[PDB]
């Protein structure tokens, strides 16, 4: 019943985001057509999705129902026709849209970075890999509260496996990807840590397009792109230290980007370090 949303009570307000396969929009859900209603975010598959995209969409909805964390977008229910995913409305939107138009100090960024690590440490503990950990998928509720907002590429990791074998896709976030994902198509929990390293780089660069990983890696050059990127990352080459980033944080990022996945810190490890770093800055 509270998980049941009828189309008849859903009024589209605006668009919230769009990926290759899905679409997120803001709706007002008012069953009493008065004012005691609520704002919800409604995710739907776009027209033209393959059978494997539809079966994965069922798994995604099941995944979000399973996840309960202060730093994970709350599942609210479904809208059945095809199926639409109903979630809570996280008002300030994504950090990719938020940061270039806002004033957020270093201590606040480090708080966001710590909360991402908290939700991510819970995700891994629930035996799931995210695979799309970037600033566009982290949502801001208020100046003190972030939520991992999209699980489109999330996957369960079987019984005693430390990695998940992935399929070659031209749609995948290549510049957020660890070398083991690009060369061997292997996604470990450690591969998400690498993406967190890239996410932290994005926050410290205010999600400025001119300083983006895409632009910096293009400059660093001097599937052919993926091939040259793997050599770059194996040579030991990394993203530059952002002007604003203190050396201890750049170290944290570099540890997150250790070439060998086993050597990278765990999300459970990152939470205290970041809490300290955030506490130190003010
Ligand atoms: N403001 C919000 N309240 N609740 C939400 C749930 C998801 C989202 C959301 C989450 C992720 C994105 N990033 S995105 O790159 O646009 C994207 C990637 C994959 C699939 C979709 Cl539909 C969108 C954009 C919006 C926003 C809100």
Author numbering: 884 to 964, 969 to 1109, 1114 to 1173
Passage from the reporting paper:
These non-receptor tyrosine kinases phosphorylate receptor chains, which in turn recruit and phosphorylate members of the Signal Transducer and Activator of Transcription (STAT) family. Tyk2 functions together with Jak2 in the signaling of IL-12 and IL-23 via its interaction with the IL-12Rβ1 receptor chain, and in the coordinated phosphorylation of STAT3 & STAT4. Here we present the first mouse Tyk2 crystal structures, which are complexed to 3-aminoindazole compounds.
A critical step was to introduce the ligand (Compound 1) at low protein concentrations, to prevent precipitation, and subsequently to co-concentrate the Tyk2/Compound 1 complex to a level useful for crystallization trials. The 3-aminoindazole core serves as a canonical hinge binder, forming three hydrogen bonding interactions with hinge residues Glu972 and Val974. The inhibitor’s central phenyl group linker positions the sulfonamide chlorophenyl group under the glycine rich loop. In the mouse Tyk2 structures, complexed to either Compound 1 or Compound 2, the steric bulk of the sulfonamide chlorophenyl moiety occupies substantial hydrophobic space under the glycine-rich loop and would potentially disrupt the His/Asp “glycine-rich loop lock,” thereby creating a larger active site pocket. The ability of Compound 1 to enable robust Tyk2 crystallization may be related, as inhibitor-induced decreased flexibility may favorably affect entropic loss during crystal nucleation and growth.
